């Protein structure tokens, strides 16, 4: 009997004032929340933000919407949301958000007989996350999502995670290319501004960076270029064109890798660990070229000393490079 | 009682003309401003602008909204803002702005018993900032936000910073990697257009650019290449091939560094200080090559004169380079 349902819904929305919160003038209305994380698409060090898609569900009680004589939850067309009160929830650290709207607005309104309202949205949000890159690429970051009431103070509304630590689901399924999610945490607190105290929910993730990409991207290329630079010591000293070609090509490849590295990062004013490693590699290749310059300089009158210097550099440079790698990987691990 | 407040608000909005300002036809209405800065996302020289996010709060008195019998301040659902008069405040130097709308429009309306309205918005705006880059990268910028009334002249409306020096908060939340905030300033004034006089608030920041590693990353390579070009003075003049090779290599390397560097920096169209520095270094290396050309020209008939000219170049060139560096760093610092 759809006519009775229609009459009941018309009666519930008769004289209903959306300008007033539930229990206006009385105790604060308690709003529970939960989130299903569908995906975390892209994490950007350049922009210091991450993108996240989620199903965001809010639960509250509105005694003006209690109905009798129908033993069912009433899932209603989402346009009824424009005729009801909803919480004024927002995200502090977001930079640009939107609700999906294909094929219609991705919104859900479900009434329960006792007056409980379930209000669901599907949201894609970009959120700010300041990153500490002092230990890059061996770093660990903490990215948060802050959820707050905009207009209502703690005397009108209260937030709580509905279900405790089970209120956020789908984190273990998330796959990120450069990162892995070590842990996620849920916090509830109050925040005081000049206009009063407001409830605050925080959802934080701790991300540990995978090293394999950096091994494949900067570490292995640097090692291979350094070995190529060491190939010069085994060519006879009178082949000037070959060894100068080797030196110039290795230096240029070092510069290209370094420029790519610094391109993929923000313009921070301090020295990073990877910067230290890259300038170590540059020092090594420059020293190899200077060694060749010296040998070519002194070899006309002392061929034996030049041969001895080249032969000893054949051993000394790999050993010192190994020591530098040891020191670097021991200071950061 | 919720019905009593409902009918009180219905009586407040009954007979309310949204087309008329408070005290229309009488003394001007005073509007107090407040800004709570959340972040400055980015500062762009190429686009000559910056992105700012803020809570913008407006305070005024509308006698038509006064109510009695309720010793409380009514925090209303923000949709009621579509039924009230609000000031037509705009930002003169903004280029693209939006109000955040997730989960709802980030808007706040608070009424007080005597008729005071507090109206809050969360706004992200990309505002223009004409930067003078003549001293770049050692430059200091001044970026402003201009707040004005569009339609109402000084006869209708007045602006003032609410709280004086404390009207703008959150300046310590501004975290720019490439800049630091030195000072902020608040200004109130009037602006005359052909349609009358309008109130104008102004919020300005002074940005100081951070030098560190990146300043060195450019200026040092040219100096080092110039010194390598000075290495030619100590090599005997019988080595025509070696010295000619040194001069050509240093010159061509200077040209390559300059071209790649300009291909790297932002594409400002005008000439910067660093361009003048690089051109000075180019002039020095070209003069060193010309000096060698002269030495090669005269040394076969006047070797003693050639040796004296080389010895004096040995002394003069480092001295003139030091003078050039001294003058440059005195003028630009």
């Amino acid at each position: 009997n759809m006519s009775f349902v229609k009459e009941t819904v018309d009666k519930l929305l008769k004289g209903y004032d959306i300008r007033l919160r539930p229990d206006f003038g009385g105790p604060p209305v308690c709003v529970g929340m939960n989130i299903d994380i569908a995906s975390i698409d892209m994490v950007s060090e350049v922009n210091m933000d991450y993108t996240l898609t989620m199903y965001f569900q809010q639960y509250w009680r509105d005694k003006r919407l209690a109905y009798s004589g129908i033993p069912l939850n009433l899932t209603l067309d989402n346009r009824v949301a424009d005729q009801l009160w909803v919480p004024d929830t927002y995200f502090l650290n977001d930079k640009k958000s939107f609700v999906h709207g294909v094929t219609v607005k991705n919104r859900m309104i479900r009434l329960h007989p006792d007056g409980t309202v379930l209000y669901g949205l599907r949201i894609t949000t970009t959120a700010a996350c300041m990153m500490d890159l002092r230990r890059y690429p061996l770093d660990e970051q903490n990215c948060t999502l802050e959820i707050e009431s905009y207009g209502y103070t703690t005397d009108d509304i209260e937030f709580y995670w509905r279900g405790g630590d089970k209120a956020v689901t789908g984190v273990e399924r998330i796959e990120l290319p450069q990162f892995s999610i070590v842990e996620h945490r849920l916090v509830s607190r109050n925040v005081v501004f000049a206009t009063g105290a407001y409830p605050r929910l925080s959802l934080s993730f701790r991300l540990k960076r995978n090293i394999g990409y950096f091994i494949l991207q900067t570490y292995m290329p640097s090692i291979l270029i350094t070995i190529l630079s060491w190939v010069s010591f085994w060519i006879n000293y009178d082949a000037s064109a070959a060894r100068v070609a080797l030196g110039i090509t290795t230096v240029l490849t070092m510069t290209t890798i370094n420029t790519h590295l610094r391109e993929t990062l923000p313009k921070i004013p301090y020295v990073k660990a990877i910067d230290m490693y890259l300038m170590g590699c540059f020092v090594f290749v420059f020293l190899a070229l200077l060694e060749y310059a010296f040998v070519n300089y002194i070899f006309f009158s002392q061929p034996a000393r030049a041969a001895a210097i080249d032969r000893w550099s054949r051993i000394v440079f790999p050993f010192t490079f190994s020591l530098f790698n040891l020191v670097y990987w021991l200071y950061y691990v | 009682n919720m019905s009593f407040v409902k009918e009180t608000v219905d009586k407040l909005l009954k007979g309310y003309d949204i087309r008329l300002r408070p005290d229309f036809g009488g003394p001007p209405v005073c509007v107090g401003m407040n800004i709570d800065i959340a972040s400055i996302d980015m500062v762009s020289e190429v686009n000559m602008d910056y992105t700012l996010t803020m809570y913008f709060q407006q305070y005024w008195r509308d006698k038509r909204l006064a109510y009695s019998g309720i010793p409380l301040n009514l925090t209303l659902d923000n949709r009621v803002a579509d039924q009230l008069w609000v000031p037509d405040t705009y930002f003169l130097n903004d280029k693209k702005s939006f109000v955040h709308g997730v989960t709802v429009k980030n808007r706040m309306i608070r009424l007080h018993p005597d008729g005071t309205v507090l109206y809050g918005l969360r706004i992200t705006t990309t505002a223009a900032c004409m930067m003078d880059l003549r001293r770049y990268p050692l430059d200091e910028q001044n970026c402003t936000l201009e707040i004005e009334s569009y339609g109402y002249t000084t006869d209708d409306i007045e602006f003032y910073w609410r709280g004086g020096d404390k009207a703008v908060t959150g300046v310590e939340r501004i975290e720019l990697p490439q800049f630091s905030i030195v000072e902020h300033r608040l200004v109130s004034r009037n602006v005359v257009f052909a349609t009358g006089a309008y109130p104008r608030l102004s919020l300005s920041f002074r940005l100081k650019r951070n030098i560190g590693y990146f300043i060195l990353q450019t200026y040092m390579p040219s100096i080092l290449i110039t010194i390598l070009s000075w290495v030619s003075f100590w090599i005997n003049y019988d080595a025509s091939a070696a010295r000619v090779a040194l001069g050509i290599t240093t010159v061509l390397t200077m040209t390559t560094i300059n071209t790649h560097l300009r291909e790297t920096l932002p594409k400002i169209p005008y000439v910067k200080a660093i361009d003048m520095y690089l051109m000075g270094c180019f002039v020095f290396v070209f003069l060193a090559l010309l000096e060698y050309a002269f030495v090669n020209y005269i040394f076969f008939s006047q070797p003693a004169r050639a040796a004296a000219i080389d010895r004096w170049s040995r002394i003069v060139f480092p001295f003139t380079f030091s003078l050039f560096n001294l003058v440059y760093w005195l003028y630009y610092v």
Partner: nanobody, 105 residues
Framework: LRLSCAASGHTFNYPIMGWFRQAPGKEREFVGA????????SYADSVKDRFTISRDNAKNTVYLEMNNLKPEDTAVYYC??????????????????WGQGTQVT
């Protein structure tokens, strides 16, 4: 006189340090705040032009130099850390990690 607050651990997640003082009969009162990186100080009215705050990241320390003292400056002093999105700068509730109390007469 000069008070030093040295912080260790996750100083990146708490980029702001603040100073408070507690009177024998009154609640905690904000004195000043300093940013770890920006070095942008903020002061209460009662200690403007008199107290100064400086920061050094070498050993993660913040110094409060007190000059031109007065007998109305006899309160137990505390140092605290504030989160990145913790709200207003003048409210003790928004500060998580509090140091040990220090007495001044």
């Amino acid at each position: 006189l000069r008070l030093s607050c040295a912080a260790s651990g996750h100083t990146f997640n708490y980029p702001i340090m603040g100073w408070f003082r507690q009177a024998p009969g009154k609640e905690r009162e904000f004195v000043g705040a300093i940013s770890w990186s920006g070095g942008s100080t903020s002061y209460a009215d009662s200690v403007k032009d008199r107290f100064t705050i400086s920061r050094d990241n070498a050993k993660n320390t913040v110094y409060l130099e007190m000059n031109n003292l007065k007998p109305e400056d006899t309160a137990v002093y505390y140092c605290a850390a504030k989160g990145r999105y913790s709200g207003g700068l003048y409210y003790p509730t928004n500060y998580d990690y509090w140091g040990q109390g220090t007495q001044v007469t």
